[PDB]
Every structure is written in C-alpha cells, then in structure tokens.
Design a protein around this nucleic acid. Sequence first.
RNA 1: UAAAUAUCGACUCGAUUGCGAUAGCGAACAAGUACCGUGAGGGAAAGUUGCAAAGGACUUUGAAGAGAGAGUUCAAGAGAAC
RNA 2: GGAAACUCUGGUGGAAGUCCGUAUCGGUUCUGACGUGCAAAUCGAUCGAUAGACUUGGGUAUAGGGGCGAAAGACUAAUCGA
RNA 3: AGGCUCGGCUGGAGCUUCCGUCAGUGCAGAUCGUAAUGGUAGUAGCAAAUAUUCAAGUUCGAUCCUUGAAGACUGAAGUGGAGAAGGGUUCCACGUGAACAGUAGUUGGAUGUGGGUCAGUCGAUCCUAAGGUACUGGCGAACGCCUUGUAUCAUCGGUGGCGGUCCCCGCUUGUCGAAAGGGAAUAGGGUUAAUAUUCCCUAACUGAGAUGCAAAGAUUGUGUGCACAAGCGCGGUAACGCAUUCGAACUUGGUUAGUCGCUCAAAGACCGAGCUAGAGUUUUCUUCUCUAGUUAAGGAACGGACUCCCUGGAAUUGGUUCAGCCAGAGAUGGGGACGUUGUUUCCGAAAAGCACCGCGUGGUGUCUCGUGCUCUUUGAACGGCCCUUAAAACACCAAGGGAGGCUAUUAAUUUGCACUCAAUCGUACCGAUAUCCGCAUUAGGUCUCCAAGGUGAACAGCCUCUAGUCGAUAGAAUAAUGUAGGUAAGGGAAGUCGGCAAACUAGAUCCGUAACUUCGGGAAAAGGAUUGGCUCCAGUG
RNA 4: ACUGGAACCGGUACGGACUCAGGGAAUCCGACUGUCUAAUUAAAACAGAGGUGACAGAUGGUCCUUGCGGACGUUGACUGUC
Lengths: 88, 99, 52, 48, 50, 104
Amino acid sequence: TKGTQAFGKKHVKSHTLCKRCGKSSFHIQKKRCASCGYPDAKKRTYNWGAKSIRRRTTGTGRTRHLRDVNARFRNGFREGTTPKPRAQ
Amino acid sequence: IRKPVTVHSRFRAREYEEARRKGRHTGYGKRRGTANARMPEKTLWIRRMRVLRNLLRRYRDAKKLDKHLYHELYLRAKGNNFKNKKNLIEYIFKKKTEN
Amino acid sequence: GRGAPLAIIAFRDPYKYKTVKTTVVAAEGMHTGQFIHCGAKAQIQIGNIVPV
Amino acid sequence: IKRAVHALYNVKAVKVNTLITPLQQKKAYVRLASDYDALDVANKIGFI
Amino acid sequence: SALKKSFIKRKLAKKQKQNRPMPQWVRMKTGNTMKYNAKRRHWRRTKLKL
Amino acid sequence: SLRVTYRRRLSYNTTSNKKRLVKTPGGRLVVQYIKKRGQIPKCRDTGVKLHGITPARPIALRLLKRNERTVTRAYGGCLSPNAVKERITRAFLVEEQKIVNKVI
RNA sequence: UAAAUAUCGACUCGAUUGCGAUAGCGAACAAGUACCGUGAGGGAAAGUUGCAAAGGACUUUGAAGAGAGAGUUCAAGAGAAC
RNA sequence: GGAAACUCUGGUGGAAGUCCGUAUCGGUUCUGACGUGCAAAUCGAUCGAUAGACUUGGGUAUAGGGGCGAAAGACUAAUCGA
RNA sequence: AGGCUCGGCUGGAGCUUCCGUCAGUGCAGAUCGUAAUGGUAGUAGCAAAUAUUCAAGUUCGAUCCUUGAAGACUGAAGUGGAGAAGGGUUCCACGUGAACAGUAGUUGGAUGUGGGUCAGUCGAUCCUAAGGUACUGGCGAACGCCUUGUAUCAUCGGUGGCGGUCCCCGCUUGUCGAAAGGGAAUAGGGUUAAUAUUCCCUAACUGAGAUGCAAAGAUUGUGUGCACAAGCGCGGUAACGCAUUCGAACUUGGUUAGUCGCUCAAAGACCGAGCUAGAGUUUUCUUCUCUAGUUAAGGAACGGACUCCCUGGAAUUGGUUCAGCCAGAGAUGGGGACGUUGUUUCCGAAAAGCACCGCGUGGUGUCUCGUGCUCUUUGAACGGCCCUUAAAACACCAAGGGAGGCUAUUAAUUUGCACUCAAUCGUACCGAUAUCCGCAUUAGGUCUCCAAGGUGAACAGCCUCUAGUCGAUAGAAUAAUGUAGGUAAGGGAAGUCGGCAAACUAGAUCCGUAACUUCGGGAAAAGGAUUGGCUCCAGUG
RNA sequence: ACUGGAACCGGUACGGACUCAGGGAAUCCGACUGUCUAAUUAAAACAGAGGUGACAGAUGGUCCUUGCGGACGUUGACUGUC
C-alpha cells in the first residue's frame, strides 16, 4: 500500500558521502557521485544547471592558492630577495 | 529488603494428578484431542514390538527357542499375531508342547 | 538444467606428469570404472570416441 | 603511547588501552608496572 | 548504528561540537547583533542526511 | 524459567551462530557458541570413512599429534585397507599378465 | 607573424536623470545560509534604542513571570520583539 | 482362499503444489467504524492461504518511448495510456 | 470633481513654489502576489488498547513526580531480556524559569552544566559468491564507451647447486565485491551514576619469534672392557596402536554440502520423593505452601549406536529395524579396532556465587535420589522427493614420490619448558502505541534470538509466576441521536434487489453414511447415541 | 501413563467458561493448487499441466548495441524460442 505503510520500509541508504565534494550524493551501487561525478576524472557541470554551477564554481570556497598568486603577481613574482636590511 | 516472590503453588495440580492416576477426570467429556493425539498408535505399536522382540531375544539366549521357531515367531509378531506378552508366551508354550 | 547425465573421465597427459579430466554427456550403458578409448584406432564399442 | 609515556615520565607501562570519545578525542589508559606508583606520578605531573 | 565507520563518527563529533549554545560574553561585544545560536539542531526534529 | 541473550552482535540463527545453554557457577544461564565439527576423511578411491584418523577442522588439524592424522600402512590416511589390498592385487596381476603377453 | 577588434569571467579602479528593504542581485543581516528532497536539485524570512548604555542602582508584593515607587535621559509614551 | 492366475482380511508405513487450524502472509462481506480521520488507505468483526508456483532480510542486475509485468495499461520512491 | 489650504495632537530631519522635460506616474476586483486580522468560537472537539484507590514525602503549588499498602493488566509467538538497519548523545548525574510534552507537571527522549564507550581471543580487517570495474584490443567527432572473453597476450615463479647466478620444472593470473556465507584463538566471579567475553582477580588458549635450559638422536647383534658388523623406530594375523628414530620439487585427494519424515542418545528447561535453612498459613486440617540447595572456558581418565578386522562356513535359511534392510562378493555365533557428540565420588573449585544466623569483621549449609509419546538445542543412524540433485575461493592436513641431508656417544633433527610481542577502527543508549520511516511523542510500517505453571492435542483460547506496566486530559450525570455489545412473548423471510446482518452447527468416543465418480473421492456427507463428580474393577511393562 | 467397564451421587446443564463447518437438491462459469488492477472491480480475468502448429543442423534461428561487440549458449531437435 503506497504511502504511510510503504514509508516504514525505508531503512537502506542509496547515497552516501562523497570523498571529493562531501555531499551525501555518492551512489553506493553505481560507485559514482550524482553531484560532482567522482570518481570521473573530470567534474560534473551542465549549462542548464546555472544555479548549480554558481553554487559549486570557484570563489565559493577559499581560493587560497589563487589569492596567494594574485598577491605575489603585484610585485612580479620576485624570489630570492629580502627587504632592505634595516631595524626599528 | 528484597521482598519474597509471589507464591504460585502446584498443590492443586498435584492433587489433580493423584486423582487422575486413581482414574478420575478422564471420561469422554474430559477429552479434547483425538485418541491418536492423546496416545499415538505408532508409539503403542513401537512399545509392543520392543516388548515382543525383547522377550524373543531373551528366550533364544536362554535356549528356550531354536533359531527356526524364533524366526517364525519374530515374523508373526511383526505381522501382528500377538496382542501382548501373555499372548506370545501362551503361544510359545503351546507350540513347545506340540513339538 | 540438462536432461542427460555427464560423464567425468580422466586421461593421462602425454607430455607431463598430470591427469586431465573431461566432461561429456554419457552414452547409455557407460558406467564408473569403465575404460573409454579415444582416437582413430579405437574399436567399435559403446562409449568410444572415434572418427565417423 | 608506551614510548612517549616512558620518555616523558620515566615510567614503564604494562598495558595501554585506547578509545576515541564521541568528540573524536583519543583517550588512553596506561597501566604502570607494579614498580611505579600512578598516584605519585600524577602528583609529580600536576593533575591531582 | 553501533557498528559505524570512523569518518561517520568524525562527522558526528563535529556536529556535536557545533550544536552548543552561544557564549554569553559574545553579546557584550561592540556592534554584536547575534542573540543566540540560530543553528541549533535537535536530534528528533532535524536529521543529518548522512 | 531463565532466559538467555546473544553475547555477540550477530542475531541470526546462522550456521556460524549455533549456541548452547550452560549454567554458570554464578547461577546464570548463558550462551556458549558451538564451533564447526571436523569430519572423518574418506577414501580417495571409495567413499568409506577412514578409521584411526582424528576428526578436526582444517585449521585445527595443525595442532593434533602426528599419529592422530596417519595410519601405519601404505597410503595410510588416504586409502582404506581394502582399497590398498585391491591396488596391490591389481598391480601385481596386471604386471604378470603384461609379462605373459610379452612372452607371447 | 604584432596593431587596430571582442570580452568584466578573474584582479584593481571611477561614475550614474537607476532601486531605497514586498524595491534593487536569491542574498544590505552567521545567504547560496536555515530548511526541503534518496538524488539531479529547490531555497527563504530577517535593516533602524539612544549623541553617549548612561541598558533602569535601591525600596516594596509575589515562588516567578511580573507589578507599584525610584533613577538615567532633550526625550522613555525611545526600555531591549526598543 | 485358489489347480494356477491371483484374490480377501488385519497390521505396519507415512506420500500429496491433500484437509482443519496457530504464528505469519493477504484483504471477501458488513457496501460496518472513520471519512476537516489514529491513518493522503487506517480500525473491528467476518473471511482466503498456511510445507510450498511458500514468506522474507541483505548484496547484486535491469532506467524512461526505456525497464519489469502468472497481463490489471499494472508497477517503476504518495507521481505512470510514458 | 479629481484634490487642496489652514487649525489641534503625535513625530524628529528634511521638504517646497513656478518654468521646461522625462516617467517603473493614480486600483475594488484579476479563484490577483505578499503580510496581517475577523465572524464561525471558548464552538467541533481532546471517547480504540479493562483501572485505579488510600496514606505519606518534596514543593509556593501534586490525579499525573517519589515511597509504602491494596486492586488490576501484558501473560513467555509478552506491555519481559537483547541485537541487525536507522538515529547520533537521545545514555548517566545534578539544576530548571520561559518554550515543548494538544490537561497538568516539582517530572521528561525538553532545557543548562558536566560525565560516559578501554579487546591478541567479540566483529571489521582476510577469502571468494552473484556482480562491478580496470588493463590490453576494438569502436568513437569527442567526453569516453564496449568485452572480463585465446578477445588480448613478450603478463611469470618454484626446488636445487653455486654464491647475483647456472641447471631443471612447469605456463601466465588483474582488482573490488558479504560487521547474516568461509574464517586462528576466552571463560567464570566482581566492579561503575553511566563500560564490560574489553576494566579488576583467577584460570586458559592461538599466531609470529630469536635466544637459553633439560631430555632425546646417543644404540643393537655376535664373539672375547676389547674386536667386527649394522641407518634414519617399534608392536599387532588384521582392523590399527605406540614413540618422535630425517626428507624437497611435482602429482592426487580430505576439509558435513538440499529439503521433509521416523527412531534413539546427551545437555538445558519442566515435574516428583526426601533432608536441611528462611519465609508464609494455622477457627479447623495439612510430616503442609513458596523460596535456595549452582559449577564456566581449558585439561586428565573413561565412553561412544555406525563402520571396519580375525576365526569359520550357513537351506530345515538365518540376523534384524518403529520403518527398512543384510549375507558363499562370506550371514549367525565368538573375539577385537576406530571415532567426532558426551560423562565424571578428578583438577579449575569453593578461597567463588547462593541462602541463612551473628557481631561493629565473623559463623553454618550449599546434600541424597527418581521420572518422561514431555519441549527446545546438539549429535547418531536411516528412509521419502525431484524433467528441481542442493556454492566458490582462501587456508590447513594427508598420501604417492625419494631429489637431497647427518654420520654410532658426533652431527642434522625433532620434543618439553622459560622468555617477548599481538597494530588500526566500532564498542554509550533506543530498536518502537515516544529515541527509526511516516511533517508529530502519528491506533500505520520495519529483519531476528531466549520462552515458566494450570486446563488442553497444542507456541490455540482463559487464568497465574519471574520481569514490566496502570501511559493513553480529568470530574459529575447517565436526555435524544449515535458507535460497540446482550436479550426478547407468538409467528418465522411475510422484510429486502437479494436471508445483507444476526442466529443456527461445532470438541472427543461409538454407530451410520446417498446420488455421482477420473475409483483417488464425495465424507466431518446426511443422521443418531454418550460426555460431570465420586468409589471401584480389568488390561497394557 | 493410556485404554475399556460397573455401582452410586446432583442439577436448569456435564466439549457446564474457552476454543471450533449449519446441512441438502440443482443450474452457469472456470478443471484443480496459484496470480492480479498498492488507494472503489479477487472474478467467469491471467497462469497452469495437457494439445497443436511454425522456424532453426550453427557458414544457423530469435534478439540487443551508435559502434565495437554481446544474450539464449557451460545450449545442439527428448534442444531453443515463438
């Protein structure tokens, strides 16, 4: 009987947590993430999912290395040199 | 304190069993299962066969029966010719006198 | 799934120390402990495998 | 845990039991050999 | 379940840490607007879809 | 009466979960788990059971004394005495007939 | 094989006959957050004390919420959801 | 018992997609209860089956003009003539 | 007229005339969007799951929290005790004012603050099943797909000598996938507010190890301590037994395989007879009723159906099971061999646990028997069924083989003790009429284990013991209508589409049983008689 | 432990509660056990064993895949599907 009676039998998870995106969208039997495509080498993104792209695109995280590179570019990626030896 | 458990005596059951052994509470109005369910005819037959075979074995060991008469009586018992030990013993006695 | 019995037959490997087991549908009359001869020079006997 | 306890408090351990608490913290019970006194060692360390 | 995996346990531990009332002294900070932890979770009402 | 509970987390009456009820010195009725029983090996040629061989699980066979796995006879622990008798007779008679056929 | 050309997606800037919290980006605020769906995905509401917390000491009834006085304040009928 | 063929009687035995019936699985009738319900299908009595074409857990396989179907256009996450 | 000016009150920072020009420029409706609010209305309603009462405690405050007494219920296929999935702190302790617990609340799965999950032996970990997914190869505009297969394929590793190497032997194959399959090895008592096969005490076991100690190897025969010779064990006719008296590559095997039925045995549970110890009842009766009289893992010794061996030769055929069935292819008789389950006037071990009596830490006992178509579990041995025949891997063991190895007081080599170590992750609690899914503390759904007495065929129905509950908002009263039960004179389907609903029948023993029939059935056909209590009689080992 | 029998006794009654088919004569449909429209139709509907027919001897037949290739097939007419 579809409905309340049938909802009592739902105790086996079909999706679990994904190693790459941390979402509970990793299909156990298919061994693939329904969100980011893990373990596919490439990333799952579709142009019809504009909001999904916005959610999962760059800049929504920390961009630690990108910000570091932007900061270092401002002075020409200088390396091997230190500020002029001075004091207080 | 740990209180004592509530008493559940089997005294009435014991007196009922004594009366039943004397032969009470057993009439037709007290039976709810079939005769076979109360006492399987298979169990009764097993008991009878073990009794008769034991008697025949004892007699053959004691030399009161030869192999031929033992075989004849064994097959007759398996064929349900003797109602009980008394019947078998009487038959053996009569056959031995005739022989 | 098969209505015909199978015969497990053991042969000696001619080129190494080993026995080779063969599975084939039994012909009527074949029995355990029987000797089956397979080849061009085998005689006309039930169970033998020979050129037609 | 055995090696660290020995190197930090100069006490042998005859057994080490480890569990992880519901807050993902590793807790270790270290039973010292009969030679050493756990109460004295705790007094020396500070937690007492 | 009693028989669980270490990484599930780690996620549950972080959720346990997060589910906690806000410190009272934070309400005295300059420009503070928060009045309570607005992300409290009750085990029976809202469930972690792990 | 007293009732028992499983001591392990397996809660199904599988072949690996056979149990036995035992009374303990503390007056308790507890569950003791039954391990698999060893089987007497059979003849290679026939299927009859072999005598003089102590049964045990395959991993437990490594713990028995040497005499518990063998019989002082050719093919002992592998063939039955009747099988060995038949093999000896067959070998001797077949070789004798081979010699006779060679002579002829 | 450069230049004239395209493009604010990224970083950094200047403006406007645009909107003024149901408007303007979904998001002026712990917003792609809370929450929902197994999943693809869906997705809000929520700005305002006062110049300055000076955020109502103390007395009094009640177990308390709370109330009656009192005090702060240009002002509290601006008393915290202001 | 009979010339034989074979027949009769009493036991033993325990076969069957056999029967009554508990757990269990279904859902016939009351066209009962309820019908802004306990419940987006439940409740009571009465009923079908109950050692097999049986009932079931988990792991697996089949994905949309496709699957699966002892066949009702049935089911395919309260969604199915797409 | 669209609207406008001024006055009064509130409010606290912007607003405005006129000229041009521009527009996101005027609301009563669109089952319009969004936010808020009414009458209905203190109304519908808070009625399934038998049930509560008395006294006291705490509190400002008690139907609801706690204690005691009583009365009931689940009734062992539980409203009991534990787990798998799921939940994720809901577990335990101490505070609690508001919200929530559709009444209440001093209580709470709520709320604030703290505490809590200890493993060589329990699981994961390891093996593979159905199946998934890689390599090559092919296809494909491409992301990538298809095959898991002689398609592809130059896919290696094993003994030995030498000391990397040479001889020889073979021929090739990935990797995932089961806290219910396979699988190295732990039990008892105690301890906490909350952990227990994990902690403590006691007592074991498994695997990987080098080293040390002790004993073997390390003797026999002949001749006279000496000489010669002798290998790697003995006994039994046999089934096989006993010691540790070596051994590789390779090859071949062993390691319950389904389901149902019958019989037998062991343990646990149940039930009796005493004898102790404590309780209960005693107008009257009862040598009375109830409770406690327990023994773990691991060892030693015995025991073990079936099967096997020796003797011998069977018809006047015998042996034999509940049923089978077995024998000149060697029966009966007689005598032996083997072995899993298991048992003990035995260790563990009574120094434990249990029951009772005292003191402010002591003592006593914990014993003799029986019984069974009885149940559960385990084991043994058979039989029935299939056009159904009831896993695979790993790992260990055995046999054939005799390449090799040490050289009769040496050595190789086993044996036994002593010693070290055994990582990582889970471990709390619920598991459902309130910890899961159903919007929720929802009469729904959701996989399993343990299972007392009476009546009885019975795990049926009804009552009871251990354990657990009285949680379902309460009080008064008992109008109409209602839902659910119980009856009804005389008639007996006249009611109604229709005997819908209800009533009738029923257990067991004896007797009796038609048409028809596929000969199996119909059949419990139809239809009769008996059934209680008490005192006896007879039969069945 | 179960079976059969005898005397005596009461009372509205003796399977004293409880548990448990009313029976018979016919017609139509479907042989039977079984399955089905979860949430208005459990049936005369589907299945079924049995019967007949079709194709196929593998360089084959019936299907799937964009393609490569694959399933029946660990199959071979007493087989396979329709």
